[PDB]
Amino acid sequence: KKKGVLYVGRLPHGFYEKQMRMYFSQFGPVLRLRMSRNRKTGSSKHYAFIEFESLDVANVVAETMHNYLLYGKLLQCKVIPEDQVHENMFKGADVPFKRIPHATIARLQHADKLITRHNRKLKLKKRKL
């Protein structure tokens, strides 16, 4: 019934959304999982939030996956308080990850108004000088 949000911490590199969802679905259905990722680069912030179908299963996975030594990291599995569970708790959850190739986007992006702005900037630099 109550839709238990079981968090996972100390996630080894590679234990990403696909691997977590597959592993944690084995214990119980993982409705939504959104592994935290950086806004710029989408590097796994190394913690995720699993909304197990039942609070019971989330609690069961908590006890069995807490202090779990996975590749040198003691997985911190503590069921997220349902009262503290937010609405933006799972905003855009389970999405194919979209770190735009900003570096290329700015790079492909590379007239008279720009020249005027440069002249104004030069005038501002002269004023500062």
Partner: peptide, 23 residues
């Protein structure tokens, strides 16, 4: 049921294969 160690090892292998293919 299979352990989560196999999941991460498979991902690192896939990333390892992706990296070599890009080579």
């Amino acid at each position: 049921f299979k352990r989560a160690e196999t999941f991460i090892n498979n991902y690192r292998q896939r990333e390892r294969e992706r990296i070599r293919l890009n080579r």
